[PDB]
């Protein structure tokens with residue numbers, strides 16, 4: 001049994017539905033990958049801040065949680081190939097003239113937080129994605145910098161209270177599954193399953209289903 005670790009707070013990638021079950025793109029993907037690898041799985045929810053150390057300590061066996069493949073994270077864990085192509089990061093604000101060099105909210109331990117910390121903007125970090133949106137809505141922050149695919153439905157749901165500002169920024173290597181560095185054989189099973197979904201078009205279909213007809217595909 002493979003314990004699949006996810007954040008459960010990052011729609012539409014992953015979330016806990018009203019039944020208390022893991023749901024989202026990654027629920028469907030993860031289940032189909034395990035089916036194709038011949039593995040049975042069990043889903044484990046873990047907060048983003050500790051999702052890497054808790055994989056390393058053996059609380060679960062994979063991270064499938066919208067995590068970009070990066071060299072920095074490759075220092076402690078190993079990634080499969082990407083299962084979504086690299087997509088942009090974007091700024092979101094309550095007005096068009098928001099000061100993007102002011103206070104910018106980003107989720108802790110993300111490439112977006114890293115980009116803002118290196119920038120001239122003042123970074124404020126929040127534990128969860130929803131807290132970054134709340135910080136903008138309530139005026140504690142000038143804007144939020146986050147994954148564009150996370151922000152698109154949020155902007156559409158806002159009834160005009162939230163909007164994209166500035167330009168998109170490409171960050172990170174595409175989303176991939178994380179595993180312990182001593183787990184090469186399991187990682188290889190997942191890699192072989194991902195490749196099979198790329199080859200037969202089922203991954204592209206899953207991506208468009210969850211991210212829209214215009215989503216980047218393979």
Ligand SMILES: N[C@@H](CCCC[NH3+])C(=O)O
Pocket residue numbers: 007009010048065066067068069107109110111112129147172
């Ligand atoms: N893909 C970005 C954002 C992840 C956001 C998780 N709620 C990263 O890996 O840092």
Ligand code: NA
Pocket residue numbers: 073074075076077078079181
């Ligand atoms: Na590594």
